Design a protein around this ligand. Structure first.
Ligand SMILES: O=C(O)C(F)(F)C(F)(F)C(F)(F)C(F)(F)C(F)(F)C(F)(F)C(F)(F)F
Ligand SMILES: O=C(O)C(F)(F)C(F)(F)C(F)(F)C(F)(F)C(F)(F)C(F)(F)C(F)(F)F
Length: 133
């Protein structure tokens, strides 16, 4: 039931991303660049395999994963994590686990916009994406 997430999305709003990055220990110079970067997220499916690409002028990432099946991931900030993505309440919930820590990356559709909520520790960041043709 992931179909409405699929496509190409552009960042159009960000709240508290610096807080989130700082909670994860990202260095100030990197946070400075990241705060001014507007990534493009591409979400594709091939049967029950999703691929999620994040493209920007700074860093790119790509993950592929089966819904509800754990996968190894190396994050943009070089954390080596155990990840799982599942559909929960109509949201794509990506949970990353490493060193007993956790962070969630939750995507929900609200009025045709894709809202990404990032939570680590007490930091909660909300990033809004709009669909590109
Ligand atoms: O897709 C997005 O909009 C996003 F927020 F930029 C992000 F790519 F998910 C991200 F959170 F920045 C991240 F790259 F995944 C990150 F978590 F790795 C990090 F940069 F925030 C960290 F702080 F962890 F390094
Ligand atoms: O610590 C880092 O070096 C990092 F995680 F790679 C990052 F630079 F923070 C970063 F994630 F690239 C980013 F800058 F935060 C970003 F803004 F590029 C991103 F999050 F947008 C994207 F997802 F593209 F990596």
């Amino acid at each position: 039931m992931v179909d409405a997430f699929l496509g190409t999305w552009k960042l159009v709003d960000s709240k508290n991303f610096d807080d989130y990055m700082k909670s994860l220990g990202v260095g100030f110079a990197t946070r400075q660049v990241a705060s001014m970067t507007k990534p493009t997220t591409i979400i594709e499916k091939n049967g029950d395999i999703l691929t999620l690409k994040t493209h920007s002028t700074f860093k790119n990432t790509e993950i592929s994963f089966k819904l509800g099946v754990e996968f190894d991931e190396t994050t943009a900030d070089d954390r080596k994590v155990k990840s799982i993505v599942t559909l929960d309440g109509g949201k794509l919930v990506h949970l990353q686990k490493w060193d007993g820590q956790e962070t969630t990356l939750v995507r929900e559709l609200i009025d045709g916009k894709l809202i990404l909520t990032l939570t680590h520790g007490t930091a909660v960041c909300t990033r809004t994406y709009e669909k590109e043709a």
